[PDB]
Amino acid sequence: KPNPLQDANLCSRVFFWWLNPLFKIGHKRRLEEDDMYSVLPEDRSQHLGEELQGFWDKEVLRAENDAQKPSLTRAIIKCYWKSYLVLGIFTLIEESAKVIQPIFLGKIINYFENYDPMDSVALNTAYAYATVLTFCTLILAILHHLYFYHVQCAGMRLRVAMCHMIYRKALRLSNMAMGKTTTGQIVNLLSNDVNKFDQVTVFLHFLWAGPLQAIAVTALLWMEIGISCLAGMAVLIILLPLQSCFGKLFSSLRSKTATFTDARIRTMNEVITGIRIIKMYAWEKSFSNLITNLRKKEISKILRSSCLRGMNLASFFSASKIIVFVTFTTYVLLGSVITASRVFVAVTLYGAVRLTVTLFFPSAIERVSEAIVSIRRIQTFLLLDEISQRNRQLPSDGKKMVHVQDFTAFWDKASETPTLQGLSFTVRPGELLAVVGPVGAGKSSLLSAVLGELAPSHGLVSVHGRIAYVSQQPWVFSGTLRSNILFGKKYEKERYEKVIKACALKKDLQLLEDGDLTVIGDRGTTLSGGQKARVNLARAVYQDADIYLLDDPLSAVDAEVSRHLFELCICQILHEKITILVTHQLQYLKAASQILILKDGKMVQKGTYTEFLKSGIDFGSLLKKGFQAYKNYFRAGAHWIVFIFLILLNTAAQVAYVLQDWWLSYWANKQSMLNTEKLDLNWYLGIYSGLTVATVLFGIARSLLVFYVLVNSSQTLHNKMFESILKAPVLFFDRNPIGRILNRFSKDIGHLDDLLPLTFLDFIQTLLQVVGVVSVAVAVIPWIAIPLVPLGIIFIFLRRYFLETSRDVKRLESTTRSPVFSHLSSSLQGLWTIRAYKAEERCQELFDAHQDLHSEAWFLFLTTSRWFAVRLDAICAMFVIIVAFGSLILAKTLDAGQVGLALSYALTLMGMFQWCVRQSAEVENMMISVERVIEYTDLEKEAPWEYQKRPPPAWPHEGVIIFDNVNFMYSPGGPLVLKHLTALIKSQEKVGIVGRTGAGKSSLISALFRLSEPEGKIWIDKILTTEIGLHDLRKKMSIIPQEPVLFTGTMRKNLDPFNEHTDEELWNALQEVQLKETIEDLPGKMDTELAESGSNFSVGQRQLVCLARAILRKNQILIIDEATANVDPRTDELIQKKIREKFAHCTVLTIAHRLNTIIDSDKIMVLDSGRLKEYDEPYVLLQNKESLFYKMVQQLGKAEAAALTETAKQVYFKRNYP
Ligand SMILES: CCCCC[C@H](O)/C=C/[C@@H]1[C@@H](C/C=C/CCCC(=O)O)[C@H]2CO[C@@H]1C2
């Protein structure tokens, strides 16, 4: 993939003409990783990594030689000054041009000030001055992008070298240091702390060009307007701390919202996750109240933050007006006079020096500080203790053999007992050494010591040969299965097929689409644990080293495949291979040529399996211990009257902005056309101050009103969302995952909270300033309207031709960035496996090949934006050239003031036009959040919570529940679930449910609570369920869910969220479940704040809490589901006895997985694959041997079935015959 940047001219690299081909492909189809362009030879990650590592090693060597701390900053400066000084040389020219061109503006205006149509020499000099002006703008517009590319490329280069060295160091970290750090702290300086280098360079040169330009402009101002300049200049300096006091008060109102936004998101997580429980309990009004309170206390801080942001942006808007106003007020008050040249040169000087002082220099300070902090972090990460490179091997005679003598070691220098105590044993080729020991013996530490991963404290380890190692936890990296097995080794067909067959991988390969070529991501998300272990064993076999270490390989696989692996691979293939095995299955010890027992870190005994049979020590003994979106976004915030007022306020602000400078123009014209006589100063200063004040107030009003309207618009959208999701049926929650629903209320809501109203108040600001500039240039020279139409239309087409490729390349630099982090993560978790093989240098090449794929999409993202900016500045330069020259070919009609106004505004169009375009792109990027928010504000809705026909208060009177021909389906068009359900439930009876998992046992609750409006009829005391709203049907039925959940809050709430009960009632209810005492030893009585799902509570305790809830509701209907999954037997029988003897007179339906729970129930649904077949007393069903109840009783066993039948008979005989 050749790069046209390498074969291009200078005239082609200034206009980025080498990039036209790609754009043409980008206009037709979508862009992939093949349409991409490769990188320069001087940009491959390996090259920069090697160079900067060389300089860093030299610097640390000199630090050792001179006994002071080494600094990475010095290495960076040493490696980059020779190539960073060039950029500085050019930015000096750029700032010099930005300071020079006002003077030639002044010379043109001065030619207009002394107009004489006959003096053609002055006309020619003015044409020359205009030509120099266009040269300045064409070196500020066309040569500033082949500069900005290289300024961003220096940062790209620095970051790529940094990432390469970080990975290189993290590949050889010592376990002493690797344990004190984490694997999240080794990705959080390669994903968030190495990105600063991509930005600091962009502004680095402004730490010396900022002040220099601020002195040059000040000197020019003094030369032209004199001491009064300081006055205005003073105001500009005031903008430096004032900008850093809207930041130490914005960051106190922005980090005081997280303590509310995160609370709101966490409550939303608990609401969305357990929505079945909330709906069944009919509690969602309580969570609605809680989220309303949190969202209101979050909108308060968002409203202060947005008001402050709006005031800051209006200060940015009106700062130039204030500077010019105070400057010329002082200039006139000290006794001088206004002419149209000194005014409109000083204006451009103030514009340039303001754009430098208030915008670029603080950003450079911030970014240099962030880059210095990041450099300090990467300094700390590169001084961690390394691993001793495997040193000079003692001269052997060619005998590949492992011998250990008197080995002692510690994982920590603080541990009292050493991990190993004087181990002195060896192994020879062909001898399958094995280790027997319970967990905690040190067998893993033993293999680590064999690998050298554990530092020897005493003794010696002699390992001479290639080492093949298998970790206890199988480790798979990002790649195909064949590549996973090869692990860099070249493929050999017969050597790859024997591995496959001996590892029994054929089944797994035939299960997947690509056979053995299926791509396996990180953590084995596409594989199973057995597959991971088998692929790791395949890697170990195919690497075919001299020495093999296997730590618990067969534990996680089935018996047959494990036996096959041990026999035909470990016993057969490795019978000629040095092998050390750690095992937990005793069956495989018979084939071990040796056995070592390790305990308390000490050798217990080595010998053959026969000798341990003779020792009398049984092993078990040892092993046991569009446009519509914008309209909907703007309609929500305010009615259209306020929107029309907003438009009028924008127009008034911009018009007053323009008219202040127009007033300076008019003042100059009225002064030149004079005569001693004077000019009435009070009037002129009065209207000039009035225009300045109008500009300031209208800017502030516009900013606050736009922020208020869009914040209100977001507040309304969020409220509509939330109150439209609390009413969505559970089917919607089944279709969409939690993450997608728990992200459109934290990510999407957060984008329209304090992101959307900024790029939308900035975009309007700069769009109206551009329109003001264009309208001034058209009102001064109307003929400009003719050429300016071929500069609108072209622009429009341009903005398409770019946005059909930028959006196709700002996803490539995102979908090819994650592989770097993925490989870094996958290489640290299997790091021992990587370093066990000598091929650690080969993973460096894989990292580079994953980094020469993101430094190849940052290339296109850095050059396509420049191909757009060159043409935008060509359009703006055509505009300024036409304004500067066409004001001279028409010199007979214009005057000094009009020319000054038009030409100075055309000069300030630069950069402003680009920022307008950039914010337009960002708004069109961030309206997707509004689109998603408005997609959820129009979701499905279940039947309303209230109906006209409210039920009688006594209902249910008894509990009679009649299922009449109930046909229920989870989703429309899906499989029938309950089909002609016809049953009767008489008050107070106990009806168990039997069936298969998913055969309709858990759908009766789904249909009886109308979680999905059923077809058929259900009568609760002769009242149709579908004829009453949900909260008059669910409030009168209690339930015990499968997995109890406690909602974050006081224990008062998880029982009485509506405050409808009193402390004595709650205490009594908790006493009935005997957990009363268990609570009155907590910090609070009931007001103990809890964790997620009551993490300080047990599953049985949670079931007790729900049982207490059911007791508190004291309604005459009740449903139990999955009583005790794996709860301890004491709590099991406790719950069971409470289920009977508290709820004797409360009609009970029970859906249980077992029989003892429901053996004594009065009756039983028998559900046959979604069909009710048998329903009577359990003893009657046991009388008929053909009943499914009889069959599933007998399936348990003989004694169990006999006891169950005896219990049923006892119940029958005690009940029906008194
Ligand atoms: C994407 C290209 C942007 C061009 C930047 C241009 O040279 C800026 C000039 C001023 C802009 C302020 C820029 C903001 C700083 C950019 C830094 C950042 O966004 O991280 C807007 C306020 O008046 C004009 C437009």
Coordinates of C-alpha atoms in Angstrom, one line a residue, residues 856-1191:
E856 CA -1.8 4.6 9.6
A857 CA -5.4 5.9 10.4
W858 CA -4.1 8.8 12.4
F859 CA -2.2 9.6 9.2
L860 CA -5.4 9.9 7.1
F861 CA -7.2 11.7 9.9
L862 CA -4.3 14.3 10.0
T863 CA -4.2 14.8 6.2
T864 CA -7.9 14.7 5.2
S865 CA -8.7 17.5 7.7
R866 CA -5.8 19.5 6.1
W867 CA -7.1 18.8 2.6
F868 CA -10.3 20.4 3.8
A869 CA -8.7 23.3 5.6
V870 CA -6.5 24.2 2.6
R871 CA -9.5 24.6 0.4
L872 CA -11.5 26.5 3.1
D873 CA -8.6 28.9 3.5
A874 CA -8.4 29.2 -0.3
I875 CA -12.1 30.3 -0.3
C876 CA -11.5 32.7 2.6
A877 CA -8.3 34.0 0.9
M878 CA -10.3 34.6 -2.4
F879 CA -12.8 36.5 -0.3
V880 CA -10.1 38.7 1.3
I881 CA -8.3 39.2 -2.0
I882 CA -11.5 40.3 -3.7
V883 CA -12.3 42.7 -0.7
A884 CA -8.8 44.2 -0.8
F885 CA -8.5 44.7 -4.6
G886 CA -12.2 45.3 -5.7
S887 CA -12.1 48.1 -3.1
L888 CA -9.4 49.8 -5.2
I889 CA -10.8 49.3 -8.8
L890 CA -13.8 51.1 -7.2
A891 CA -11.9 53.7 -5.3
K892 CA -13.9 56.5 -6.7
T893 CA -17.0 55.8 -4.6
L894 CA -15.7 54.3 -1.3
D895 CA -14.1 56.2 1.5
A896 CA -11.5 55.6 4.3
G897 CA -14.0 54.4 6.9
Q898 CA -16.0 52.0 4.6
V899 CA -12.8 50.5 3.2
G900 CA -11.3 50.1 6.7
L901 CA -14.4 48.4 8.0
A902 CA -14.8 46.0 5.0
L903 CA -11.2 45.1 4.8
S904 CA -10.6 44.6 8.5
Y905 CA -13.7 42.4 8.8
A906 CA -12.5 40.4 5.8
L907 CA -9.1 40.0 7.6
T908 CA -10.8 38.6 10.7
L909 CA -12.8 36.2 8.6
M910 CA -9.8 33.9 8.7
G911 CA -9.9 31.1 11.3
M912 CA -13.4 32.3 12.3
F913 CA -14.7 30.6 9.2
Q914 CA -12.9 27.4 10.0
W915 CA -14.2 27.4 13.6
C916 CA -17.8 27.9 12.3
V917 CA -17.4 24.9 10.0
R918 CA -15.9 22.8 12.7
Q919 CA -18.8 23.5 15.1
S920 CA -21.2 22.8 12.3
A921 CA -19.6 19.3 11.9
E922 CA -19.6 18.8 15.7
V923 CA -23.3 19.7 16.0
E924 CA -24.3 17.3 13.2
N925 CA -22.2 14.7 15.1
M926 CA -23.8 15.3 18.5
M927 CA -27.5 15.4 17.3
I928 CA -27.4 11.6 17.2
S929 CA -27.8 11.8 21.0
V930 CA -31.0 13.8 20.5
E931 CA -32.2 11.3 17.9
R932 CA -31.8 8.4 20.3
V933 CA -33.4 10.3 23.2
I934 CA -36.4 11.1 20.9
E935 CA -36.4 7.5 19.8
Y936 CA -37.0 6.4 23.4
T937 CA -39.5 9.1 24.1
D938 CA -41.9 7.3 21.6
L939 CA -41.9 3.7 22.9
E940 CA -44.6 1.2 23.6
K941 CA -46.9 1.6 26.6
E942 CA -48.7 -1.0 28.6
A943 CA -52.3 -0.7 29.8
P944 CA -52.7 2.4 32.0
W945 CA -52.2 2.1 35.8
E946 CA -55.8 3.2 36.5
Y947 CA -59.2 2.5 34.9
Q948 CA -62.6 4.1 35.3
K949 CA -64.0 1.0 37.1
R950 CA -62.1 0.9 40.4
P951 CA -62.5 -2.3 42.4
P952 CA -64.3 -2.6 45.7
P953 CA -62.0 -2.0 48.7
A954 CA -62.8 -5.5 50.2
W955 CA -61.8 -7.2 46.9
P956 CA -60.4 -9.7 46.8
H957 CA -63.0 -11.0 49.3
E958 CA -61.7 -14.6 49.4
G959 CA -59.2 -15.3 46.6
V960 CA -61.2 -17.2 44.0
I961 CA -59.1 -17.2 40.9
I962 CA -60.5 -18.7 37.7
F963 CA -58.5 -19.3 34.5
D964 CA -60.9 -19.5 31.6
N965 CA -59.3 -20.5 28.2
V966 CA -56.2 -18.5 28.8
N967 CA -54.0 -18.5 25.7
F968 CA -50.8 -16.6 26.6
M969 CA -47.8 -15.7 24.4
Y970 CA -44.5 -14.0 25.4
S971 CA -44.3 -12.0 22.1
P972 CA -46.7 -11.6 19.2
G973 CA -46.2 -14.2 16.5
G974 CA -44.2 -16.3 18.9
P975 CA -44.8 -19.8 20.2
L976 CA -47.9 -20.5 22.2
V977 CA -46.9 -20.8 25.9
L978 CA -50.2 -21.4 27.9
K979 CA -52.8 -22.9 25.7
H980 CA -56.5 -23.3 26.8
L981 CA -55.6 -22.8 30.5
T982 CA -58.8 -23.8 32.3
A983 CA -58.6 -24.1 36.1
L984 CA -60.3 -23.0 39.3
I985 CA -58.7 -21.8 42.5
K986 CA -60.9 -21.8 45.6
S987 CA -60.0 -19.5 48.5
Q988 CA -57.1 -20.4 50.8
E989 CA -56.0 -23.6 49.0
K990 CA -52.4 -24.4 48.2
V991 CA -51.7 -25.3 44.6
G992 CA -48.2 -26.5 43.6
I993 CA -47.1 -26.5 40.0
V994 CA -45.1 -29.2 38.2
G995 CA -43.6 -29.3 34.7
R996 CA -40.4 -28.9 32.7
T997 CA -38.0 -25.9 32.8
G998 CA -39.6 -23.4 30.5
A999 CA -42.6 -25.6 29.7
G1000 CA -44.9 -22.9 31.2
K1001 CA -44.2 -23.1 34.9
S1002 CA -42.9 -19.5 35.1
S1003 CA -45.4 -18.1 32.5
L1004 CA -48.4 -18.4 34.8
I1005 CA -47.0 -15.5 36.9
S1006 CA -46.2 -13.6 33.7
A1007 CA -49.8 -13.9 32.5
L1008 CA -51.6 -13.5 35.9
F1009 CA -49.9 -10.2 36.4
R1010 CA -50.6 -9.2 32.8
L1011 CA -46.9 -8.6 32.0
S1012 CA -48.0 -9.3 28.5
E1013 CA -51.8 -8.9 28.0
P1014 CA -53.1 -12.4 27.8
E1015 CA -55.8 -13.9 25.5
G1016 CA -58.5 -15.6 27.5
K1017 CA -60.1 -14.7 30.8
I1018 CA -58.9 -14.5 34.4
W1019 CA -61.5 -13.9 37.2
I1020 CA -60.3 -12.7 40.6
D1021 CA -63.5 -12.8 42.8
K1022 CA -65.7 -12.6 39.6
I1023 CA -63.8 -9.6 38.2
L1024 CA -62.0 -9.8 34.8
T1025 CA -58.3 -8.9 35.1
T1026 CA -58.1 -7.1 31.7
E1027 CA -61.0 -4.9 32.8
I1028 CA -58.9 -3.3 35.6
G1029 CA -55.7 -1.3 35.4
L1030 CA -52.4 -2.7 36.5
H1031 CA -51.9 -1.0 39.8
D1032 CA -55.3 -2.1 41.0
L1033 CA -54.4 -5.7 40.0
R1034 CA -50.8 -6.0 41.1
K1035 CA -51.1 -4.1 44.4
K1036 CA -53.4 -6.9 45.7
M1037 CA -51.2 -9.9 44.9
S1038 CA -48.0 -10.7 46.7
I1039 CA -45.1 -12.7 45.3
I1040 CA -41.8 -14.2 46.2
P1041 CA -39.4 -13.9 43.2
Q1042 CA -36.7 -16.3 42.1
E1043 CA -33.7 -14.2 43.2
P1044 CA -34.6 -11.7 45.9
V1045 CA -33.3 -8.2 45.4
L1046 CA -32.9 -5.3 47.9
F1047 CA -33.0 -1.8 46.4
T1048 CA -30.3 0.6 47.6
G1049 CA -31.8 2.5 50.5
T1050 CA -32.8 2.2 54.1
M1051 CA -34.3 -1.1 55.3
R1052 CA -37.4 1.0 56.0
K1053 CA -37.8 1.3 52.2
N1054 CA -37.2 -2.3 51.1
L1055 CA -40.3 -3.2 53.2
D1056 CA -42.4 -0.1 53.2
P1057 CA -41.3 2.1 50.3
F1058 CA -44.7 4.0 50.4
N1059 CA -44.5 4.7 54.1
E1060 CA -47.8 2.9 54.5
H1061 CA -46.7 1.0 57.6
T1062 CA -45.5 1.8 61.1
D1063 CA -42.3 0.8 63.0
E1064 CA -44.1 -1.6 65.2
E1065 CA -45.6 -3.4 62.2
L1066 CA -42.2 -3.7 60.5
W1067 CA -40.6 -4.9 63.8
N1068 CA -43.3 -7.5 64.2
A1069 CA -43.0 -8.7 60.6
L1070 CA -39.2 -9.1 60.9
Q1071 CA -39.9 -10.9 64.2
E1072 CA -42.1 -13.4 62.4
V1073 CA -39.2 -14.4 60.2
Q1074 CA -37.0 -14.3 63.3
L1075 CA -34.6 -11.9 61.5
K1076 CA -35.7 -9.0 63.9
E1077 CA -32.7 -9.7 66.2
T1078 CA -30.4 -10.0 63.2
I1079 CA -31.1 -6.4 62.2
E1080 CA -31.0 -4.7 65.7
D1081 CA -27.2 -5.0 65.9
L1082 CA -26.5 -2.7 62.8
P1083 CA -25.4 0.9 63.0
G1084 CA -28.9 2.2 62.2
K1085 CA -32.2 0.6 63.5
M1086 CA -33.7 0.4 60.0
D1087 CA -31.9 3.3 58.3
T1088 CA -28.7 1.4 57.4
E1089 CA -27.8 2.3 53.9
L1090 CA -27.2 -0.9 51.9
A1091 CA -25.1 -2.0 49.0
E1092 CA -26.2 -3.6 45.7
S1093 CA -28.7 -6.4 46.3
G1094 CA -27.9 -6.3 50.0
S1095 CA -24.3 -7.6 49.6
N1096 CA -24.1 -7.5 53.4
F1097 CA -27.1 -9.9 53.5
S1098 CA -27.4 -13.5 52.5
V1099 CA -29.6 -15.1 49.9
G1100 CA -31.7 -16.7 52.7
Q1101 CA -31.8 -13.4 54.4
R1102 CA -33.0 -11.7 51.2
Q1103 CA -35.7 -14.4 50.9
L1104 CA -36.7 -13.6 54.5
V1105 CA -36.9 -9.9 53.6
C1106 CA -39.3 -10.7 50.8
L1107 CA -41.3 -13.0 53.0
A1108 CA -41.6 -10.1 55.5
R1109 CA -42.7 -7.9 52.6
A1110 CA -45.4 -10.4 51.8
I1111 CA -46.5 -10.5 55.5
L1112 CA -46.7 -6.7 55.6
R1113 CA -48.8 -6.5 52.4
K1114 CA -51.2 -9.0 54.1
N1115 CA -53.3 -9.5 50.9
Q1116 CA -55.3 -12.7 50.5
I1117 CA -53.5 -14.0 47.4
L1118 CA -49.9 -15.1 47.1
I1119 CA -47.5 -16.7 44.7
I1120 CA -44.1 -18.4 45.4
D1121 CA -41.5 -19.1 42.8
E1122 CA -38.1 -20.9 43.3
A1123 CA -38.3 -21.0 47.1
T1124 CA -34.7 -22.2 47.9
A1125 CA -32.2 -22.6 45.1
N1126 CA -29.0 -23.4 47.1
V1127 CA -29.9 -21.9 50.4
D1128 CA -28.6 -23.6 53.6
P1129 CA -30.9 -26.4 54.9
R1130 CA -31.7 -24.6 58.2
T1131 CA -32.9 -21.5 56.4
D1132 CA -34.6 -23.8 53.9
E1133 CA -36.8 -25.5 56.6
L1134 CA -37.2 -22.1 58.3
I1135 CA -38.7 -20.6 55.2
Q1136 CA -40.9 -23.6 54.5
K1137 CA -42.4 -23.7 58.0
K1138 CA -43.1 -19.9 57.7
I1139 CA -44.7 -20.5 54.3
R1140 CA -47.2 -22.9 55.8
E1141 CA -48.0 -21.6 59.2
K1142 CA -48.1 -17.8 58.4
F1143 CA -50.0 -18.1 55.2
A1144 CA -52.6 -20.7 56.1
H1145 CA -55.6 -18.4 55.3
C1146 CA -54.0 -16.7 52.3
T1147 CA -54.5 -18.5 48.9
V1148 CA -51.2 -19.7 47.8
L1149 CA -49.9 -20.8 44.3
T1150 CA -46.4 -22.3 44.3
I1151 CA -44.1 -22.9 41.4
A1152 CA -41.2 -25.0 42.8
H1153 CA -38.5 -27.1 41.2
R1154 CA -38.8 -29.8 43.9
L1155 CA -41.6 -32.0 45.4
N1156 CA -41.0 -31.8 49.2
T1157 CA -41.8 -28.1 49.0
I1158 CA -45.1 -28.8 47.3
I1159 CA -45.9 -32.4 48.3
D1160 CA -48.4 -31.3 51.0
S1161 CA -50.0 -28.7 48.7
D1162 CA -53.8 -29.1 48.3
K1163 CA -53.7 -29.4 44.5
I1164 CA -51.2 -29.4 41.6
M1165 CA -51.1 -28.0 38.1
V1166 CA -49.5 -30.5 35.8
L1167 CA -48.1 -28.6 32.8
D1168 CA -47.2 -30.8 29.8
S1169 CA -45.1 -28.8 27.3
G1170 CA -47.3 -25.7 27.8
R1171 CA -50.5 -27.7 28.4
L1172 CA -52.4 -28.3 31.6
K1173 CA -53.3 -32.0 31.7
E1174 CA -53.7 -33.2 35.3
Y1175 CA -55.1 -31.3 38.3
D1176 CA -56.2 -32.9 41.6
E1177 CA -54.8 -33.7 45.0
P1178 CA -51.3 -35.2 45.0
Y1179 CA -52.4 -38.5 46.5
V1180 CA -55.0 -39.0 43.9
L1181 CA -52.5 -38.3 41.1
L1182 CA -50.2 -40.8 42.8
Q1183 CA -53.0 -43.4 42.8
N1184 CA -52.9 -43.5 39.0
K1185 CA -49.5 -44.9 37.9
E1186 CA -49.9 -43.3 34.5
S1187 CA -50.0 -39.7 35.9
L1188 CA -47.0 -37.5 35.1
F1189 CA -46.9 -36.7 38.8
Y1190 CA -46.4 -40.4 39.5
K1191 CA -43.6 -40.6 36.9

